[PDB]
Design a protein around this nucleic acid. Sequence first.
DNA 1: TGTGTGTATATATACACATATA
DNA 2: TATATGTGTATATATACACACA
Lengths: 213, 213, 441, 441
Amino acid sequence: KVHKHIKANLCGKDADTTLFLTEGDSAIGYLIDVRDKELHGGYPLRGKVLNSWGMSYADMLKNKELFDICAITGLVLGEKAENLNYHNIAIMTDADHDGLGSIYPSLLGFFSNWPELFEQGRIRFVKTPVIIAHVGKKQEWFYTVAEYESAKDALPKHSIRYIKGLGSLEKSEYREMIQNPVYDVVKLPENWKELFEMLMGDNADLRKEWMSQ
Amino acid sequence: KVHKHIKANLCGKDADTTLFLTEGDSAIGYLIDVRDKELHGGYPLRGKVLNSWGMSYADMLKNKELFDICAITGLVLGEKAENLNYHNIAIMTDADHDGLGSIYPSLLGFFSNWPELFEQGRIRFVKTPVIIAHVGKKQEWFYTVAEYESAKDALPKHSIRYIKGLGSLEKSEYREMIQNPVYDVVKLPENWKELFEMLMGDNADLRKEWMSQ
Amino acid sequence: MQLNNRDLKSIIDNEALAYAMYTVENRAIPNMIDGFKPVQRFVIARALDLARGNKDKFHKLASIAGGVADLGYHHGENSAQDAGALMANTWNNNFPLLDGQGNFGSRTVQKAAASRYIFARVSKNFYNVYKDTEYAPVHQDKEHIPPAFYLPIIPTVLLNGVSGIATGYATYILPHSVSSVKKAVLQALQGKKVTKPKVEFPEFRGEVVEIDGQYEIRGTYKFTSRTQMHITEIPYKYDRETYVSKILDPLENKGFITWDDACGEHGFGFKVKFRKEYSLSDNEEERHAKIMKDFGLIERRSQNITVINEKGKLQVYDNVVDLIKDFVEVRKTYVQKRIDNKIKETESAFRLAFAKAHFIKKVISGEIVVQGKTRKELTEELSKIDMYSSYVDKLVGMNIFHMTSDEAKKLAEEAKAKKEENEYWKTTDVVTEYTKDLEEI
Amino acid sequence: MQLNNRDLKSIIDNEALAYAMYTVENRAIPNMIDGFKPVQRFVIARALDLARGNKDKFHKLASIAGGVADLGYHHGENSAQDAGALMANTWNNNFPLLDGQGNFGSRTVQKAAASRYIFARVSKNFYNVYKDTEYAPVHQDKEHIPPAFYLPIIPTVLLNGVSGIATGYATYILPHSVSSVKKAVLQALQGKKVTKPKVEFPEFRGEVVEIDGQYEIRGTYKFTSRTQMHITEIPYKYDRETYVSKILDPLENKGFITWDDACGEHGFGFKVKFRKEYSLSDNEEERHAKIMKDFGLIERRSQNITVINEKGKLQVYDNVVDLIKDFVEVRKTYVQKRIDNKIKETESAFRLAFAKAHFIKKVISGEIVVQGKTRKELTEELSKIDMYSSYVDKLVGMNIFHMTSDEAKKLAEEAKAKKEENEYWKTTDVVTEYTKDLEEI
DNA sequence: TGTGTGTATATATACACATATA
DNA sequence: TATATGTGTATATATACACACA
Ligand SMILES: [Mg+2]
């Protein structure tokens, strides 16, 4: 057993059970209350995920988080994904810059050693509001800061709430985003190896050309 | 061998070497700068000391802080103190209630395993100001809160600084308290066992009776 | 270098005794009046200072904990953060005194999120119950910015439940229903037979039975079939992880049960299927006892009502009714103090308003012109008049428009209104004011 | 359930790119003008907010870090605590912008105490070189309470030494002497040839040498005998633990040396006694080279001057003189902005003061008699007058004591003084004000 | 091919104290 | 005998990123 794994009732058996990969303990406290007990499980991932591009499998498994991810599911780092405890893996991290642009693509890189979960659509991202604007009598949700800045001008007088992490949301909003999900089904392009090598790699000059355009 | 232990240049040689038992690592700062390099060594503890009264030797040695007081010194739990790396043991702790009310008497109870150390005056307490009052153009140093309250009414207009720990002191004040130290030499009374049993024994009714007078 | 001998008896009788009495009277035993440990008093005083401007603004718990050190807090700010996070939740308090924004924990996970995530503000319960803050006692410590204790109208120490451990003493008070406490306070204030308040646990759908002083907190189970059983509630002390690891896990590895989670929006719920190895008796009473004992569905709790009274010393109460009576007797004195202070303040305000109105009426139509003179000599000339005496810095500090028709009458009407307020405050008594305050709830 | 496909290319080009650019432009690379990383700017803004009413009061690092989230800080307060501790060390900064109380570390132990002990306030250096805060640019985010950047008169990015790692870009600028930087700034402002500022480390008694764009930081040793030597200084990259565990102890556990701690008022003093098997060559040059190499007494550094300019973009400089020239060119514009705004504000102030002073003389036996009319009568009749067209509200809001000769002549004196000051502000130029404010350091 | 720098992400531990309950 | 509750005393640990210097 895994200490902080929260098992779904149908986990391991034949169902569409989804594993929720939060980026901390604080982001999963409300998950067990607002989830589908038969079909949802969770596991908190501590901090920034290991940069596992070009690493060996033995080096990969030396990380507690990656080892626990492989243990909770049926994923063997050198074998195919055939018999898994969870049908879907739903990465649901904090929507700020660190969670969305560092932990999420690194987790995608770690899951890229099984480039068939992506093809079958079993790798998902749970959209989470980074900005919650109290416009008049209604709450508007902005998932990325760029969207809010683009749409900030054409709104009436309001006050915004910045969602630093999923522990900043209330149970009503957590329940709304869990039982009424917005899923981004990640699909790997033909040249996914080049995009992963550029962002995750030894050469830092490849990130300078990319960042200058 | 012992990590975090700063060694005196005459540790293991015939000299008036002193070991400063410091509560925490933030309090060990500025000691390496203001200490007598040939005669003063230091070791940072970690918070509250394990209650060692009535304990077995194999159980006291399981505490890392107590284990690294018998390694830094030549102290053996079941043997007399005849070959010691440091001549004196100077307990210097934060002068707030917690430090000098729990850590100091607990350390005394631990060192009571060698009453010959107390008989030789090798166990000392380094008095440290808990309140520094800026009175006019001068500074008043109060080592205990009760000492400050006893003279607060007669003191003129002033502003007091409360010293939570040794990490709240300027380098000048740290140097003044180290190179011009005010020691209190601990002497065990004829019935020290009864006092230690009252303070640290498993019966809280004795503590209630002691506190009710 | 000074070397002074210090016997262990002196150390134990001074420093150790000071620490023990500090842990009792200033760390872990709550005050009887407001029900605050000193850290909670600091946290709520800082939250009030933060909410001075806008009362509906949510402030980060790190922001609240940072400023308590300037109010007289002498410890780490993580203790203040943890104390604040335990005061701003609706699963552990019957009468929360802070609203929280974010994940402050639940009955399943009794652990709030990190203080970098969650915000807090002073609750409407605090404003509804805690009255006469301006008349609260002044702490003997000049560096203690918050008062010695706040002045609520009902005993909050009985509402949320307190559990504290000190050196030599400990306190454990169970939470009570707000309605029963208010009714008991009303009965005590009116001079009646005080009915013992009922013990109520927040978010608890089970039973609480008082037997021989003990309190039995009982969960609920039902039987869907012969071998299937649904647990609808568990005793209040349990978590999801704690109950699973202590009861539900050391029953499946023993080959007795197979359990599934059903902890829906209602709260705690499980579905247990009994294997053939685990056998139940024929009758319902022994089977019920075995089931309710094996699954840990009974929690037995005793009450250790130890509180710091209004004099700062320790006090142990046999029951809750005596505590309520003592609280009411203490609070009536502060209601009387409020009445006296408001009488004096209304008298002073009426005197000032009438003096200003007379000064205006003399300026527009009278010998006083405030022209062709100086400031110091005008002040002396005003100080000549007995009525204008003691108000010379507030009479010449009035604006020009106060000499207009629309603003000369307003001063006289304000003087009349303040006189009527002073007359109102000179006829009420403690009982009526306290009854009105209770009626506010 | 809104199952929308999302390619990895779009993820990388939107969210990964946003995070990388945010790390470059908002976390790691300092601003060229004020020399602040955004966390440092938030800490400075909060400390300035806390300094209102008492410039000399010391505030806990917890107190400073708690309120930065209200100013628009979107990260955990621990990073703010660490940055604030690093900004008040003096042993690490040539120009400390925060004054510290407590243990903020030393060269021997390069680690500050916990934030629960240490206090900080705004240093006098900040008040000395950071001018024109009211004319600082406004950040495009309404929630970013501190300005886009502050406005120092000398480049503070060159004074304390900057090291920062972002995604794709990194910055490393060595500390420079404050006096040399000020002289170079004055030379650039006056249009003369600019001399390269000297690199100087805080509390370092070694030697710094420039060679082909690389800086050599050299410690010092002195031979007190044929076999015993005294290490008086070691390079700035070392603390006591690292030097002991990486240089002294590896040599000691090889039969080469035996070392004793000879530190004191000046840190990093050691006494090394060589053993028989460590052969000190008779050649003075070879002996010196061997002692430098074996004891790690030479550190080699190179700068990577990467900054954020006033437009928010990233700029890489190959020199410090170029940065100083660009900083002076940018700061001259803000000096001009200050001059223009002062002209406007002081003209408005003089107009208001003259209007008030003439209104008061026109109330003392004048055509305007306040008494006997309503509020609208004054607020409309005076609004008719051209001179009081936009000042009637402040005209009628003045106090009654502004009607005696003593306080009536003071209004005219204030008007005349404001007129003279505005006339003074209408003749100065950028160079004069810059020279005046530079020479006051 | 380590590695140290400093903002960020997230988390963890060992100690004391009492008293009822299991 | 063994837990556990809440206010306190002290610490700790993985990760990412660039790049020059060993
Ligand atoms: Mg300390």
